[PDB]
């Protein structure tokens, strides 16, 4: 949905699974400074103070972004 | 609770109930141009293209806003 | 990019070009408030409550900041 | 207010004041992209993907726009 992480291999921003997006976005809305999530057993932490995702198995750091919708909304 | 409506009587922005905030925020995230909700004995439409809430019983209009959290977050 | 709500017309209204520039400059500088005048009336915008206040009467009208989509559409 | 991500250090990095101003001026004017130079390096920032492209090598560096809280907090 609205969070993305950048894949350096493909050179593209990528969406999370619905479940992981909801876990991240819920922690964002609750004021937490970081959040843990998994893809299967693979562990990750998103650090909101640096906007980086840390792969907790390889240590690789990928940037994250929060997409923003226009305000006000455009007419259809 | 990230949506707010302005109360001209008190001069303050006000929160929605958790459930009404969720209805509004779910329609916002889904790309809808407006959303209806019920609070007490009144039905309201939030018009996202104008950022105004309309009381459908009386026609009264109140402005709305979406709060935004800082990016990046502070330590 | 800044607007104030006019309850008489029931609509958000744009600020004048100069008032918009004055308000947006203070916003970007991290200030908590900014002064301006319109129609020979003195106002303060309070960014911590997102309202404009008539300094003589105390009347509060809400303000909003338009936001651009991120990413941008093609 | 604009930042680019450095995959070597794993950190977001600031632009020079002049390059930040070039990027932000194009952002505010509705452009879909903007070119800038830093020394011998030549880049395009693509706002539709939030990526900076090195015009010589094609290397992609993600970019971000910092966002100030609304409403603002008291000091
Ligand atoms: N940003 C603005 N830009 C242009 N016009 C504005 C703005 N803000 C308000 N106005 C207009 O400014 C006018 C006043 O709104 P207000 O400054 O809030 O103060 P009050 O409501 O206590 O009215 C104060 C006195 O003015 C009258 O004679 C009344 O009888 C009062 O005696 C409205 O027309 C607004 O649309
Ligand atoms: Cl990268
Ligand atoms: Cl990895
Ligand atoms: Cl009402
Ligand atoms: Cl004005
Ligand atoms: Cl590069």
Residue numbers in the entry:
A (entry chain B): 1615 to 1690
B (entry chain C): 1615 to 1689
C (entry chain D): 1616 to 1689
D (entry chain A): 1616 to 1690
The article reads:
Unlike RNF146 WWE, the single domain WWE family members HUWE1 and TRIP12 exhibit higher potency for ADPr over iso-ADPr in our binding assays. The HUWE1-ADPr and TRIP12-ADP crystal structures revealed high conservation of the ligand-binding sites, with most of the ligand interactions being conserved. The phosphate groups of the two ligands occupy pockets with favorable polar and positively charged groups, interacting with Tyr1658, Asn1669, Thr1672, Asn1674, and Arg1676 in HUWE1 and Tyr809, Asn820, Thr823, Thr825, Arg827 in TRIP12. Despite the terminal ribose having electron density in the HUWE1-ADPr structure, it points towards the protein surface with no additional directed protein–ligand interactions, indicating that the ADP moiety may be the smallest unit that HUWE1 and TRIP12 recognize. Firstly, Tyr107 that makes a key interaction with the distal ribose oxygen of iso-ADPr in RNF146, is replaced by tryptophans in HUWE1 (Trp1619) and TRIP12 (Trp771)—the tryptophans would be incapable of making a similar interaction with iso-ADPr. Secondly, the region interacting with the distal phosphate of iso-ADPr in RNF146 contains suitable polar and positively charged residues, while the corresponding region in HUWE1 and TRIP12 contain some acidic residues including two aspartic acids (1621–1622 in HUWE1 and 773–774 in TRIP12), making it less positively charged, and therefore less favorable for potential interactions with the distal phosphate moiety of iso-ADPr, explaining the lower iso-ADPr potencies observed. Taken together, structural and affinity data suggest that the WWE pocket of HUWE1 and TRIP12 recognize the terminal ADP moiety of PAR, rather than the iso-ADPr moiety as described for RNF146. An overlay of the TRIP12-ADP and HUWE1-ADPr structures show a highly conserved ADP binding site, with the substitution of Thr825 in TRIP12 with Asn1674 in HUWE1 being one of the small differences. A mutation of Asn1674 to threonine in HUWE1 had no effect on PAR11-mer binding, indicating that the potency of PAR binding is determined by factors outside of the ligand-binding pocket, possibly including the PAR polymer structure.
